[PDB]
Design a binder for this molecule. Structure first.
Ligand SMILES: OC[C@H]1O[C@@H](O[C@H]2[C@H](O)[C@@H](O)[C@H](O)O[C@@H]2CO)[C@H](O)[C@@H](O)[C@H]1O
Ligand SMILES: OC[C@H]1O[C@@H](O[C@H]2[C@H](O)[C@@H](O)[C@H](O)O[C@@H]2CO)[C@H](O)[C@@H](O)[C@H]1O
Lengths: 134, 134
């Protein structure tokens, strides 16, 4: 089952740091910040091989009973199957600030202007090893 | 709903630190380390007023489809309704090492000799504000 932190509010100004390991033959895994598995304010998918996407990040939001909004992509991909990764996220009213394993950064809009989130979870072909939310 | 960290293995040698706030009129709240809401290796209940228990800690384990084992109690109680608390837990094969808000400590046996746990959760009349598991 997915790895998740639930009902510990991730509030404006706090930092989230997750560490984990990518599966050896992973297709893709995502890190997700939102309210539920059907309501995601920041989805960041790490695609090793998914349709036409090879070694790319795909970011988006998921709206409950509505679906996926406008995707954003990054070619930054310091991720390796079988190896550890670390991701750090913080946000303000307008922007999610994401930092990747190698120090490179991606930003994604806070489309609802949310000030807090009650669910963080990893899905797909990876596992989490540690978390700091504070 | 309860506050929980699920499927991020709390392994031998790692530290868990949780911060939160006690509800103003709290009866009791617990911090729980185990596998499920019916399988708890270390339950630590903070009882402000519960039956005959006033301002006491009660620790125990809960075995799936079996029930509560032998309780252990502590009179250490540096907890106040409406106020923040912080708890730090680590364990080895035989012992859970718990440190309370004021630096006082409680120990509780690792009765199954478990080396890892997939569920941490808070229940009852409090809320969590931060977590470190690493
Ligand atoms: O937008 C994130 C979302 O993508 C879905 O896949 C998209 C894919 O990125 C797009 O190229 C194709 O046109 O449509 C697919 C279906 O919506 C993933 O399925 C989904 O899990 C999220 O990762
Ligand atoms: O053992 C922890 C467990 O206690 C239950 O309450 C006990 C109570 O401590 C004991 O004094 C009384 O003899 O039996 C009660 C019922 O088992 C709590 O109900 C339970 O939630 C845990 O906190």
């Amino acid at each position: 089952d997915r790895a998740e932190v639930r009902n510990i509010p991730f509030k404006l100004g706090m930092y989230l740091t997750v560490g984990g390991v990518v599966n050896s033959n992973a297709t893709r895994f995502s890190i997700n910040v939102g309210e539920s598995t059907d309501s995601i304010a920041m989805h960041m998918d790490h695609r090793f091989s998914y349709g036409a996407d090879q070694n790319v990040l795909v970011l988006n939001s998921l709206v409950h009973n509505v679906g996926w909004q406008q995707e954003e992509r990054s070619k930054k991909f310091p991720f390796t199957k079988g190896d550890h990764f670390q991701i750090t996220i913080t946000f303000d009213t307008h922007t999610f600030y994401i930092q990747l394993s190698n120090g490179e950064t991606v930003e994604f809009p806070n489309r609802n202007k949310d000030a807090a989130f009650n669910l963080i979870y990893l899905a797909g072909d990876a596992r989490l090893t540690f978390v700091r939310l504070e």
